[PDB]
Amino acid sequence: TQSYTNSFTRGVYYPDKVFRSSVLHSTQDLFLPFFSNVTWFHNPVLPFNDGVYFASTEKSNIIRGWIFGTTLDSKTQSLLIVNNATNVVIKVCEFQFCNDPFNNCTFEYVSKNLREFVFKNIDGYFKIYSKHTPINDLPQGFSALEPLVDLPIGINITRFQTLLAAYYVGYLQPRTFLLKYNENGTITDAVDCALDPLSETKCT
Amino acid sequence: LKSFTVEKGIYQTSNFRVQPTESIVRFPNITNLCPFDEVFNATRFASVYAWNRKRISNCVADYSVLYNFAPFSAFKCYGVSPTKLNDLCFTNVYADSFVIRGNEVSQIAPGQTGNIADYNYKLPDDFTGCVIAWNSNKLDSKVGGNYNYLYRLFRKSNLKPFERDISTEIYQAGNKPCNGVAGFNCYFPLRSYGFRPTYGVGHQPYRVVVLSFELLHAPATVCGPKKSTNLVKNKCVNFNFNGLTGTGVLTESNKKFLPFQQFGRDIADTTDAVRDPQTLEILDITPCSFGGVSVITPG
Numbered sequence: 001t002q003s004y005t006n007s008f009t010r011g012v013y014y015p016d017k018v019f020r021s022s023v024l025h026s027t028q029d030l031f032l033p034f035f036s037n038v039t040w041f042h043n044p045v046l047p048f049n050d051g052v053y054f055a056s057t058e059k060s061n062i063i064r065g066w067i068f069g070t071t072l073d074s075k076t077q078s079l080l081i082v083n084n085a086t087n088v089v090i091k092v093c094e095f096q097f098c099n100d101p102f103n104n105c106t107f108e109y110v111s112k113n114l115r116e117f118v119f120k121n122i123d124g125y126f127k128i129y130s131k132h133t134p135i136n137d138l139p140q141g142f143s144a145l146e147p148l149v150d151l152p153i154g155i156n157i158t159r160f161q162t163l164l165a166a167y168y169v170g171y172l173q174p175r176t177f178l179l180k181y182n183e184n185g186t187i188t189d190a191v192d193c194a195l196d197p198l199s200e201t202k203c204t
Numbered sequence: 205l206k207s208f209t210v211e212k213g214i215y216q217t218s219n220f221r222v223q224p225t226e227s228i229v230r231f232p233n234i235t236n237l238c239p240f241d242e243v244f245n246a247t248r249f250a251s252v253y254a255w256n257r258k259r260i261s262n263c264v265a266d267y268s269v270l271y272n273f274a275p276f277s278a279f280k281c282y283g284v285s286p287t288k289l290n291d292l293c294f295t296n297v298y299a300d301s302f303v304i305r306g307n308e309v310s311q312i313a314p315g316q317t318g319n320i321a322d323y324n325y326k327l328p329d330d331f332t333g334c335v336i337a338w339n340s341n342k343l344d345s346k347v348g349g350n351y352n353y354l355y356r357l358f359r360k361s362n363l364k365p366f367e368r369d370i371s372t373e374i375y376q377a378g379n380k381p382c383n384g385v386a387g388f389n390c391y392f393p394l395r396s397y398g399f400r401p402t403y404g405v406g407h408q409p410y411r412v413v414v415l416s417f418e419l420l421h422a423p424a425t426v427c428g429p430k431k432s433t434n435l436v437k438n439k440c441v442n443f444n445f446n447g448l449t450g451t452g453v454l455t456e457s458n459k460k461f462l463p464f465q466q467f468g469r470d471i472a473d474t475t476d477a478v479r480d481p482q483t484l485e486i487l488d489i490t491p492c493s494f495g496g497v498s499v500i501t502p503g
């Protein structure tokens with residue numbers, strides 16, 4: 001299935017590590033546009049462009065990990081995030097596994113509910129932001145995505161696939177947002193400066 | 205006023221400025237030291253032809269570990285001076301460890317050929333890294349000979365740098381097909397470095413580990429220690445909190461940084477607070493006091 005669903009106001013991460021309290025900050029970055037449309041796949045591979053907004057709801061741990069990098073095997077290296085429910089191992093040493101998963105090894109980093117993830121590559125860093133939310137579906141509301149990791153792997157990534165539901169996918173775009181930091185650095189609200197003219201006025 | 209007679213009044217003369225006293229440097233706890241005891245302290249040094257790459261990227265390059273055996277006879281640098289190399293950013297470190305013999309170590313150098321630098325190994329004349337000398341032939345040599353130093357003796361041409369040649373192809377140096385058997389000019393391309401603890405300065409065993417550095421377009425992950433200083437507060441200092449040098453006064457703060465947040469800012473984007481790397485604390489930053497100096501004077 002390849003249905004499409006409204007993205008609502010979801011997929012806002014902390015742009016950087018700077019703390020800010022009770023302030024409205026205007027930042028230009030790869031954000032998921034508000035009220036956009038997102039695939040609801042349950043397709044061999046989806047592309048990457050300049051970042052994605054993987055999200056999921058199935059708690060059965062069936063959406064285990066992901067695969068990144070150009071092509072899939074035997075060239076240009078491929079990221080192999082795979083979870084283990086005790087270890088959260090990330091491998092940049094490709095498994096050379098089949099096209100429907102269930103070499104020069106160089107990186108082996110180790111570390112009811114809605115899971116939101118953002119992956120991006122800017123210049124030699126694979127940044128993963130993530131967030132969990134006890135949803136009472138992509139509910140309307142707001143929840144900022146606190147960063148998790150900033151891997152320094154210098155891969156070039158153009159496509160991606162997923163290990164093996166709730167295979168939500170959205171695509172980041174270069175947008176200007178106006179974020180609100182309430183009193184403790186938590187992004188409680190955001191305004192998309194290109195959605196509607198009212199938001200343009202708010203950002204101005 | 206550019207005048208000798210000052211009329212009664214108040215005049216702005218100078219700009220008083222509190223000046224910093226110390227230069228604070230703060231960096232996180234020095235952990236994940238790069239693996240070198242496994243390559244520097246090991247009796248299983250690889251063969252000269254059968255050398256092995258060493259993967260050293262995700263750690264802090266304790267480059268000063270060379271002083272663990274300061275009796276090093278030579279520490280000849282070839283990529284950069286050590287003083288600069290205590291803190292340099294590289295994308296990967298490749299080390300190989302072997303023992304050849306005696307005074308043949310000069311063949312492990314830029315612009316050198318012959319035997320070790322001919323078919324067993326070689327390095328380009330623009331090599332980056334250092335070559336070390338801590339010959340420990342006391343155990344490397346035995347009265348039995350230790351002919352088990354498997355080293356290639358024959359090869360069609362010069363060996364390319366950074367390539368492994370475990371090939372066992374007979375050196376057919378005669379004008380007759382060899383077929384792999386030992387006839388005339390048909391000898392197995394490998395020989396013995398059998399050394400007893402009585403050989404000469406050019407024939408006794410040795411102790412070799414040479415490591416090179418590289419920096420491609422991938423971001424660098426090899427760095428040296430940062431050497432953070434102490435932390436002092438309540439006085440104008442020159443701090444450097446892992447990415448930002450600034451002059452100011454550090455004080456205890458009641459701010460509630462989220463666990464992932466390092467910096468701290470306010471309107472106009474000026475650093476107002478900083479999270480301390482070593483101990484997890486929030487320090488408010490206040491600019492060092494300053495202001496105009498007026499002179500209240502009668503005429």
Ligand SMILES: *[C@@H]1O[C@H](CO)[C@@H](O)[C@H](O)[C@H]1NC(C)=O
Pocket residue numbers: 004005006037038
């Ligand atoms: C965007 O998603 C909506 C959701 O129903 C869908 O109707 C629409 O066709 C999608 N747009 C494109 C260009 O596919």
Ligand SMILES: *[C@@H]1O[C@H](CO)[C@@H](O)[C@H](O)[C@H]1NC(C)=O
Pocket residue numbers: 083084085086087089
């Ligand atoms: C998951 O993989 C890591 C990688 O070594 C391993 O250490 C861990 O034990 C694995 N988890 C389980 C439950 O086997």
Ligand SMILES: *[C@@H]1O[C@H](CO)[C@@H](O)[C@H](O)[C@H]1NC(C)=O
Pocket residue numbers: 070155156157158
């Ligand atoms: C990655 O490889 C080269 C080196 O960065 C780059 O020019 C190329 O465009 C990239 N390939 C991709 C993104 O598929």
Ligand SMILES: *[C@@H]1O[C@H](CO)[C@@H](O)[C@H](O)[C@H]1NC(C)=O
Pocket residue numbers: 182183184460
């Ligand atoms: C921010 O901090 C306050 C404590 O001052 C606490 O109630 C809570 O963590 C946050 N409150 C709001 C309204 O964001």
Ligand SMILES: *[C@@H]1O[C@H](CO)[C@@H](O)[C@H](O)[C@H]1NC(C)=O
Pocket residue numbers: 233481482483484
């Ligand atoms: C750094 O080391 C000190 C020394 O014991 C310790 O008290 C502190 O908790 C450590 N901090 C981190 C972030 O490891």
